[PDB]
Design a protein around this ligand. Structure first.
Ligand SMILES: CC(=O)O[C@H]1C(=O)[C@@]2(C)[C@H]([C@H](OC(=O)c3ccccc3)[C@]3(O)C[C@H](OC(=O)[C@H](O)[C@@H](NC(=O)c4ccccc4)c4ccccc4)C(C)=C1C3(C)C)[C@]1(OC(C)=O)CO[C@@H]1C[C@@H]2O
Ligand SMILES: Nc1nc2c(ncn2[C@@H]2O[C@H](COP(=O)(O)OP(=O)(O)OP(=O)(O)O)[C@@H](O)[C@H]2O)c(=O)[nH]1
Ligand SMILES: Nc1nc2c(ncn2[C@@H]2O[C@H](COP(=O)(O)OP(=O)(O)OP(=O)(O)O)[C@@H](O)[C@H]2O)c(=O)[nH]1
Ligand SMILES: Nc1nc2c(ncn2[C@@H]2O[C@H](COP(=O)(O)OP(=O)(O)O)[C@@H](O)[C@H]2O)c(=O)[nH]1
Ligand SMILES: Nc1nc2c(ncn2[C@@H]2O[C@H](COP(=O)(O)OP(=O)(O)O)[C@@H](O)[C@H]2O)c(=O)[nH]1
Ligand SMILES: [Mg+2]
Ligand SMILES: [Mg+2]
Lengths: 426, 117, 428, 426, 428
């Protein structure tokens, strides 16, 4: 039951650097790979994430993908690059320059054969795999460009494993290149085909969470990804740590996904409070579900009070009673059943883990599936239809060897994806 | 349900992988597309996993019929000895205990006297 | 003179984690196996140590890792500790067919070892759920094989029924439709356990505002200890399980009894308490103490079996029988005139050091066949028909190779289940 | 059971200087010949390699052959020439100048009568012989020129002993003279006829091993031969040191050679790792067979994934369990049986020595026999057919007394040798 | 009342390095020869010291140097330490003809010294392999000469059969074809030992994940100590080996018995253990406890000889015979109706301080003649026919002067060997 976290791009290598920061800190491990914790919970489930070498050294089972050394040079020269083996440090020169057609079709394919060879050298060393993990951005030329080539080849190899990625929804406020909606539409044309599920993560929504709810001044990319790693490790460790409702992600993939192309999730983090209300707030189960239902605590810029919930996952952490969980889960269904689909009475999956987090006595993680996900999908498509007509910077990708009717098919798949939500919205 | 991508995951990596085996497999991958069956079974001589032939067995009364390779035409359910499957992480063939043969079984082996020298 | 307890899934093992501790409470049994005097749930070794007759089934190692690393592991054997490696993914088709097929070759091989060790096997009991992946799929896999192998043994199930309001998975009605027809086909007796009614018992009759699955299995297995371990123990009227299968199930397909128990006294409720025989049976007639969210007032009683503990006088029971006939709101059927079976054990019921139940002089278990059970099946069928209309989640079993025509076939079998209560309910 | 290591040429005298460096260091012996070790393993098997003189002085049973003093002058003036007796220092003046016809036919025969007289003076002093060891290059004029004259006469004298040499395969990158493929073809015309077996050693393949796998900067000839002496002493000491599978080389010569003219081996060294992954790698039996199957760790520039394995020898060193050895040996046969011959089910010979190496807890040595050996044989012959037509620098060997149809017979023997691999490849 | 153990090759000496240590465990024997009370494997000197009756044969000095420089060398005599100087090069022809001819003149001369020292010689046993050079060639050389000299003595071999999947040399099928016809010609009883099935015993019934040849010979010779040393030791039913040669071999060419042993208990398995007489014999019927990779289910049993140790009650054996006749999956032949020979020794089995076996009260050895042995010979013949078709390695014996026509001649003798199991297997 082991998970490989293949990290791609300048974003996802920076995002997952905050992730394995938490994982080493969750188990109390020295930055050189030496275990110094005192729990059998921190001792038994090492196999899922870490490869134990000789001398109590733990090799993190995570792969760093980029066409530039620059992102990985800072992580290696900084802390927690010492626990990484140099076999995780696979790159080329030069980069694609946030280009999808260079990372997927012309130049980025040359490194993937070296990358997937390390995947085969890792998976043969693995005892039992449960699913492969990825993280990039939708506007990532090396993150999503090489990544859609990866997931297409791994699903060819491994049909039975959980194929998920953690892709970043492009913000209209955050603009780097103009061909970013080109990169997002060509990704979703393959990410629906090749992945089993993914999350919806928008930095612009995370900009509101830092200031409106947590009262923070300067959100940096590490501070944003510190909240994301609380949600990344908040889900997958419940597969690892024991509990009364042990929620496998493959159990979660059955319960949350009604149609195999409808696999887009709305993550949420429940114990969000600033340090001023630290002396003001009591930590109860109705308190967190109040903030789980809060639209301001959502990691994607959507209105769930406008959309309707397909499925809801309630990931819980801590020593909780089953009565307080089930009654509070019912009362939200008693209150806001109009935001649910009609043909299912229980649209909320409960997931209680007995193992409490560190520091917090209780913590929880929201995962939702609403019909308001197509709202951000309209933000990509309407920006796409303006760009597709005037063909601005298209000669860059045209010299790479791309076709315009291929782009319309990706647009039609985006047109299909919105209409699939329309069939189950009302 | 179908065994055809799993069989294509098998012989392209485990059995028919080889530069000398590349002209042999090119007659076989085209033959799998012509076949209407979803459940494909590979023939083996011993536990050394040597690619003998490929069959089209289905748990219903659809035929055992030899699709491509060297082997007997009809294989009865008495003739089977051991049942085989594939591990994608191992890229080898694991042993199955005796049971009702169906889609989750990927290959087999047969009796030694049924072979001719 | 022996039988074996079977625990399949995450639900039933967490039941049996408490029940074998309850069985150590029956004689004050040490964690190594040392006990002064009883070989029905146990097998005695040459060193005077006893091992349970327990079957522990879960395809996930995590619950198995909880058992092998806790207390009483010196009692337990790796033959009893059967674990899997890959999850059933909360699926019936993976529990019954896909994942469970590689383990059932070992599991059936382990039982034939233990059944060879038994001298005079009475039967077995299986603890699981209706809507799970392991406890619904592999239970349908196992009970199919045990009915072929051992036809003349007791086939008991004390199964957990998910609430119509409280369900931890959406596929719990999607699993239990295929499970139930296979369950009714093979089982000799099957109970239903609704934890929502158990939540009502804890919050009011015990005043426990924070229960977990540990405290639920304390109260459940205490009833089961009066059901299982007590009927072998001698009293004023010693009745075994083999006479129940005739006297409680006269039907070909009627073996769904409602298990009730209502001496339920908190630690503070014991100070204002004096309960006779008839006073407890009046509390057993309460809808709050039925262990299943149902209404017995609108259901027709086929039978009423009574299990007693401790301070029992049979002359006072005869007054309590006339008391029940005085307080009739029962709608008892006319196919049997006055069949009210009584089982009496002299031994007092046990109380766990660490539980919230007080010490009582007597305990009364009541079994009943009522026609209000199908209303819980009516809640199950309406959920499944909405899922069958939209065809949601159907690719998880067609991807396993299941047929959509088999899905409505088991619905007509679920319809044939509700026809059975209709034939009893209409006719008299 | 004693072994004479006759070293010939500027190459093999430099190669074997690194070899007896290891042998004195393996037994913990002073550079003057004085034993200072503490093991009976270092005390009992001295007779196989060393001649004990009066006063605990060990005479290395090895012969240094050259037609120039210059190579031996550095070894004598340097360390470990002091343990050598002056009788080992047999040479003439001047040299052949990398010439085969001068070293074999005209001038080199005058010293061999003095050299083989010392062989008779050594073999009469020996108690029991097991085989005679040699080392040269295929492009060695004094190494292989005199050496083919040696093996032709010793096989006349002692047919019953193991007649092997350690010849260096000429690299297309390493060019000194243009008549080097002339010298290699005329050698193999006699080396197949006169020797019992040999290895295939290419320095160009060793250039990849030092840099790609060991991450070294400047591979010198001593640094190359330090790796070769780990493989030279890795094979023959298992004949000496005890074990559960004591593998005689004459037992190995039976098990590895199916056809008497087909006696060419592919050596490999298993514990190859740099000092950066020294803190990262666990030393297990599946770890080494992973690197035994690695084509990058081969001492000859051949593709074993192109060729097919005739026979495989697995020389092992260390305290290993028989279960982990046999099961790992089976799984490689289960994996890549297509790279084997058909008519043999067990193409891998196991050889476990109980005596562990110094420093390493586990070490191993790969020996393969593939059909890809003919690939480098085509590299000589295609260079030979170009050179044979234009007769470039042929008048040098023509004045020595050589005939062109003799060269065609060596070419025909080279043509037969490739075709014998063609008979057993497919 | 004496016999001599013979160890030929690298295989049999490493067995005998453990077995004579096991024989020191039989009486707590000191390494010099001092022991209080037993002269069957030993000869007593005037100083009260005992020397083994052991024959140590290897043409390589290295294994001999291991023996003469280790412990118990005060027991050993240089008459027993027979060494060579030149290897047999893993060859049958060099062991039988070329190299072995210079040593056999001394080796036969040493045996006639020791046989002169014996008073009432019962016979001997030879430990070797089938596919080796010394243990196949020189064994064929030695057993040819011992059958000429001593015709009326016991001729035992406990030989190691290489696995069809695991073989340390490619010439191991190439040697064993010529060996087996000469082996069948001279031997009175010959066993086969497949270490791959021994590997399955260590990893599961002992849970040893890292065994070596030392730990294998601990388990093998412990069975042999119950076979060899125990039958002279007195019990409730004292039976020698001379009655086995009639009752287990009624055939001219049938003397290949399957030696099985299944009390196999690890150090932790003893804490949960109670094995009766019939329970061990059920474990002896397991395919995992056969010591040879074979299937006893599809083989026809000619005989079933039983050797017992320790806590044995003969009345319970008669119930165990009816237990075996109840559990029949044996396919027992009709040429003998119910011939089931039992040997009972009162003395408990021994346990090595330093091994991984636990202390048991009783040990059961079982001998059987089955028809599934030829399937292991079918693996040998198909490998040899591929080598005979391609004519690989044939120059190593034509260089020794052997004939290619003799090679297919022994194949027809190997074919005539498989005819012998065909004549028993078809007819009934
Ligand atoms: C005195 C004290 O208890 O301080 C807290 C604290 O006050 C607050 C501010 C914490 C703190 O978190 C942050 O300030 C923060 C900032 C940006 C993004 C994410 C977090 C805390 O860092 C977080 C930290 O949480 C943990 O340690 C969890 O185990 C968490 N791990 C990490 O966040 C972590 C930190 C450093 C290195 C590696 C991991 C976790 C959560 C989910 C899954 C796994 C681990 C705790 C208790 C505290 C501090 C220190 C202030 C909060 O977060 C968590 C995860 O508890 C922010 O919302 C809560 C509210 C808490 O009151
Ligand atoms: N009363 C009680 N109910 C439990 C317990 N554990 C689980 N359940 C119930 O079991 C149901 C969920 O079933 P699962 O245990 O997740 O499923 P499973 O049968 O074990 O099989 P898998 O899904 O394959 O793991 C719900 O109705 C829970 O209320 C327990 O300890 N006590
Ligand atoms: N169980 C076991 N098998 C052994 C042991 N030693 C060797 N073998 C087996 O013996 C076979 C190899 O035979 P060798 O010992 O090399 O050959 P030999 O008969 O001694 O003769 P030579 O080849 O001339 O040295 C293999 O099947 C090994 O598994 C041992 O101590 N225990
Ligand atoms: N949260 C977060 N977003 C980032 C980070 N770096 C880049 N991004 C976002 O990722 C997108 C650009 O894609 P990126 O993956 O970095 O480019 P690539 O290197 O070609 O894969 C933009 O939407 C950026 O805002 C980071 O460290 N954190
Ligand atoms: N590895 C290695 N190769 C050498 C060395 N000296 C020469 N060679 C190789 O040997 C070949 C030349 O033959 P050489 O034996 O030196 O000539 P000789 O003195 O006439 O025998 C070329 O392929 C050289 O690369 C050395 O010290 N080490
Ligand atoms: Mg479960
Ligand atoms: Mg030997």
């Amino acid at each position: 039951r082991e998970i490989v976290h293949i990290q791609a791009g300048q974003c996802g290598n920076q995002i997952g650097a905050k992730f394995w920061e938490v994982i080493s800190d969750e188990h109390g491990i020295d930055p050189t790979g030496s275990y110094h914790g005192d729990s059998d919970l921190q001792l038994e489930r090492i196999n899922v994430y870490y490869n134990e070498a000789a001398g109590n050294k733990y090799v993190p089972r995570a792969i760093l993908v980029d066409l530039e050394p620059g992102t990985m040079d800072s992580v290696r020269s900084g802390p927690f690059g010492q626990i990484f083996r140099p076999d995780n440090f696979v790159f080329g020169q030069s980069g694609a320059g946030n280009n999808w057609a260079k990372g997927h079709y012309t130049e980025g394919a040359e490194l993937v054969d070296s990358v997937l060879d390390v995947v085969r050298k890792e998976s043969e060393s693995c005892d039992c795999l449960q699913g492969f993990q990825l993280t990039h951005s939708l506007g990532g030329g090396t993150g999503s460009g090489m990544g859609t080539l990866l997931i297409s080849k791994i699903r060819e190899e491994y049909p039975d494993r959980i194929m998920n990625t953690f892709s970043v929804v492009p913000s209209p406020k955050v603009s780097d290149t103009v061909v970013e909606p080109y990169n997002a539409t060509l990704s979703v044309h393959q990410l629906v085909e090749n992945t089993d599920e993914t999350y919806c993560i928008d930095n612009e929504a995370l900009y509101d969470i830092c200031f409106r709810t947590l009262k923070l001044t300067t959100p940096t990319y590490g501070d944003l990804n510190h909240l994301v790693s609380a949600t990344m490790s908040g889900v997958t460790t419940c597969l690892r740590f024991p509990g009364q409702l042990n929620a496998d992600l493959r159990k979660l993939a059955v319960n949350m996904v009604p149609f195999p192309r409808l696999h887009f999730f709305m993550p949420g983090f429940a114990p969000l409070t600033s340090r001023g209300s630290q002396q003001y707030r009591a930590l109860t189960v109705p308190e967190l579900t109040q903030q789980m239902f809060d639209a301001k605590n959502m990691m994607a810029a959507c209105d769930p009070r406008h959309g309707r919930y397909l499925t809801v996952a309630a990931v819980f952490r801590g020593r909780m009673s089953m009565k307080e969980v089930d009654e509070q889960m019912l009362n939200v269904q008693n209150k806001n059943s109009s935001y649910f689909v009609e043909w299912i009475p229980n649209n909320v999956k409960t997931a209680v883990c007995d193992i409490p987090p560190r520091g917090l006595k209780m913590s929880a993680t929201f995962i939702g599936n609403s019909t308001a996900i197509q709202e951000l999908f309209k933000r990509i498509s309407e920006q796409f239809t303006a760009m597709f007509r005037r063909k601005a910077f298209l000669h860059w990708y045209t010299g790479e060897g791309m076709d315009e009717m291929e782009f319309t098919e990706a647009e039609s798949n985006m047109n299909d994806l919105v209409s699939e939500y329309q069939q189950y919205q009302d | 349900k179908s065994n055809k991508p799993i069989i294509h995951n098998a012989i392209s990596h485990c059995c028919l992988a080889g530069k000398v085996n590349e002209p042999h497999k090119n007659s076989i991958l085209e033959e799998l597309e012509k076949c209407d069956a979803n459940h494909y079974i590979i023939l083996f001589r011993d536990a050394g996993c040597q690619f003998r032939a490929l069959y089209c067995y289905y748990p219903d009364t659809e035929e055992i019929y030899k699709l491509t390779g060297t082997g007997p035409k009809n294989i009865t359910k008495k003739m089977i000895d051991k049942l085989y499957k594939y591990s994608s992480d191992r890229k080898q063939f694991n042993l199955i205990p005796a049971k009702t043969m169906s889609v989750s079984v990927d290959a087999l082996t047969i009796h030694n006297h049924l072979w001719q020298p | 003179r022996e039988c074996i307890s079977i625990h399949v899934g995450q639900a039933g093992v967490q039941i049996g984690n408490a029940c074998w501790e309850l069985y150590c409470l029956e004689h004050g049994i040490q964690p190594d196996g040392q006990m002064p005097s009883f070989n029905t749930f146990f097998s005695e070794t040459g060193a005077g140590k006893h091992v349970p007759r327990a079957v522990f089934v879960d395809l996930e190692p995590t619950v198995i890792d909880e058992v092998r690393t806790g207390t009483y592991r010196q009692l337990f054997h790796p033959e009893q500790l059967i674990t899997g490696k890959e999850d059933a993914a909360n699926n019936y088709a993976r529990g019954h067919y896909t994942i469970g097929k590689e383990i059932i070759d070992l599991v059936l091989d382990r039982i034939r070892k233990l059944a060879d060790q038994c001298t005079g096997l009475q039967g077995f009991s299986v603890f699981h759920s209706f809507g799970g992946g392991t406890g619904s799929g592999f239970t349908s896999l196992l009970m199919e094989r045990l009915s072929v192998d051992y036809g003349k043994k007791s086939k008991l199930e004390f199964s957990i029924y998910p609430a119509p309001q409280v369900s931890t998975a959406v596929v719990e009605p999607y699993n239990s439709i295929l499970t139930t027809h296979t369950t009714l086909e093979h089982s000799d007796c099957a109970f239903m356990v609704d934890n929502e009614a158990i939540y009502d018992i804890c919050r009011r009759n015990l005043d426990i505002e924070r229960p977990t699955y540990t405290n639920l299995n304390r109260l459940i297995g205490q009833i089961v200890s009066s059901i299982t371990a007590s009927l072998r123990f001698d009293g004023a009227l010693n009745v075994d399980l083999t006479e129940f299968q005739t006297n409680l199930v006269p039907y070909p397909r009627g073996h769904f009894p409602l298990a009730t128990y209502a001496p339920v006294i908190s630690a503070e409720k014991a100070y204002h308490e004096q309960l006779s025989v008839a006073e407890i049976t009046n509390a057993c007639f309460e809808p709050a103490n039925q262990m299943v969210k149902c209404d017995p007032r609108h259901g027709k009683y086929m039978a009423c079996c009574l299990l007693y503990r401790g301070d029992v006088v049979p002359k006072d029971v005869n007054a309590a029988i006339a008391t029940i006939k005085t307080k009739r709101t029962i709608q008892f059927v006319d196919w049997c005139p006055t069949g009210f079976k009584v089982g009496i054990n002299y031994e007092p019921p046990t109380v766990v050091p660490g539980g919230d139940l007080a010490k009582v002089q007597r305990a009364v278990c009541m079994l009943s066949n009522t026609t209000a059970i199908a209303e819980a099946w009516a809640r199950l069928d309406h959920k499944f028909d909405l899922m069958y209309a939209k065809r949601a989640f159907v690719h998880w079993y067609v991807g396993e190779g299941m047929e959509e025509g088999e899905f409505s076939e088991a619905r007509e079998d679920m319809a044939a289940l509700e026809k059975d209560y209709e034939e009893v309910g209409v006719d008299s």
